[PDB]
Design a protein around this ligand. Sequence first.
Ligand SMILES: CCOc1ccc([C@@H]2c3c(-c4ccccc4O)n[nH]c3C(=O)N2Cc2cccnc2)cc1
Length: 380
Amino acid sequence: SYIRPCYFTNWAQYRQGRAKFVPEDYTPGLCTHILFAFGWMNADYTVRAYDPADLPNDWAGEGMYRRVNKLKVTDTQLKTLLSFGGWSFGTALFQGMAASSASRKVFIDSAITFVRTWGFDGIDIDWEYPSGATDMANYVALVKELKAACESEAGSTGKDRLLVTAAVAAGPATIDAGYDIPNLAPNFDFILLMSYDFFGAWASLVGFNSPLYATAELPAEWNGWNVDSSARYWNQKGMPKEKIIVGMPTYGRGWTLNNASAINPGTSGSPAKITQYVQEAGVGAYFEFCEMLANGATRYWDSQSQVPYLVQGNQWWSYDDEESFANKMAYVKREGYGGAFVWTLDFDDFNAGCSNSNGQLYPLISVIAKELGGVIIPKK
Ligand SMILES: CCOc1ccc([C@@H]2c3c(-c4ccccc4O)n[nH]c3C(=O)N2Cc2cccnc2)cc1
């Protein structure tokens, strides 16, 4: 069976209007696993909730942990994992936590207790990123000792052991500097390959967020910065294909063009205008792009990289859609990878609110559910 994870983000509930996303917007069968972004860590390496609203309390109610895990009542095949780390979390705390057997044990024991208390079936590590020989060996030890402690807890209690996964870098330099892949593979149930964010508004080069392959439209120095190169790289370095879960974005990345008459991939720009709901310069959600198209933006298909882009005046957006998801699912099956995961549930048109919707909940993620899972996600 293909593995079909999806990231839930606990901050999407703070978006306005049609963009507000809560666990009850999930629909059964959409994912095989939900990864909860994010759990947090104290200075002493014990774990805690990132957002006080994750926990049951007077002002939040049941809390996001309980609301996500309640989804298993109506989706009995669903498993959940708590993801520790992420971009904002940074590296310093991971570097300290991973430094010794004793420091790792504090975190490991605390994380196992915490996920059992709050009803998760696994621990996902999103350290961005281990870097250098010290981090590399400490990360190997962390994942090995975490799996071992999960095996020990399972034998002690008689329960199925917690899963151990990680969201991992896709760029060759970052992979080389931080990941000892042959010594990591035995101890992961699977990895979430972050095969996206290859080009973006941190730089002036206009390119694709998640091109499936390279294009000669972009400079040759970036020929490894695409989904297929990153998946091949992990496999060649020793990760079995069945453990490589290909990353799928439901957001896009965009630029304000330096010259509105120069619209080719490989042109130059600054960040796109901030979008209404995401409120982050240079990114936007699928349910924003659908309205841009309805409002007259011109859509192009890049045949080498196998992803769309759109142009609206001086705004140029790389994004993903049903068509690019479908071709990427054909790729996953043809190349034998273990599945595909989504960042995020909340950037798809989760409520079928797009003006051009045919009623389909989750038009993008539904492609994964159908092509990899045989699941037909309903219309609203
Ligand atoms: C130079 C690229 O810089 C970044 C690329 C990606 C992220 C993503 C993200 C977003 C976000 C991503 C896309 C659009 C809008 C958003 O707010 N918001 N919080 C997080 C977070 O922690 N991320 C990391 C992550 C972790 C696990 C699995 N995949 C990704 C952050 C920075």
